[PDB]
Amino acid sequence: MDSASKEETLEKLDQEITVNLQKIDSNLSFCFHKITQDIIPHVATYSEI
Amino acid sequence: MENPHEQVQANILSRIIGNVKRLNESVAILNQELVTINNRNKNLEIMGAICDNYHSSVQFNLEATNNKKPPL
Numbered sequence: 001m002d003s004a005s006k007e008e009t010l011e012k013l014d015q016e017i018t019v020n021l022q023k024i025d026s027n028l029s030f031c032f033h034k035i036t037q038d039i040i041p042h043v044a045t046y047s048e049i
Numbered sequence: 050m051e052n053p054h055e056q057v058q059a060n061i062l063s064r065i066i067g068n069v070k071r072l073n074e075s076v077a078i079l080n081q082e083l084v085t086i087n088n089r090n091k092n093l094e095i096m097g098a099i100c101d102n103y104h105s106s107v108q109f110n111l112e113a114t115n116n117k118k119p120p121l
Contacts, residue, residue: 008105015106015113 002008111117 004101004105008109011106012109012113015110019113
């Protein structure tokens with residue numbers, strides 16, 4: 001295909017791995033926020049009820 | 050006694066040999082200058098390679114995420 005473009009593709013893989021890691025981190029942080037701020041307080045409210 | 054053409058042709062041949070020598074000198078200096086200029090310019094391949102690599106890097110970084118702006 002191309003040599004400059006094959007090095008470019010290796011760099012593509014590097015970029016994609018980085019961005020996928022960032023997305024995974026964001027998703028897990030959202031899950032943590034949902035668990036800590038929403039689910040547990042509602043469980044406590046149900047307990048009080 | 051000798052044909053004068055022979056003498057005049059020997060003279061002009063001497064002139065042509067001298068002129069060829071001068072041409073050789075000039076071409077040698079030209080080669081030296083070209084070698085020097087290429088050796089000094091060798092850094093520009095480095096600069097262009099890194100600039101091209103960075104341009105490709107930013108282009109695919111705008112491709113990878115959807116952050117590539119629309120064409121103005």
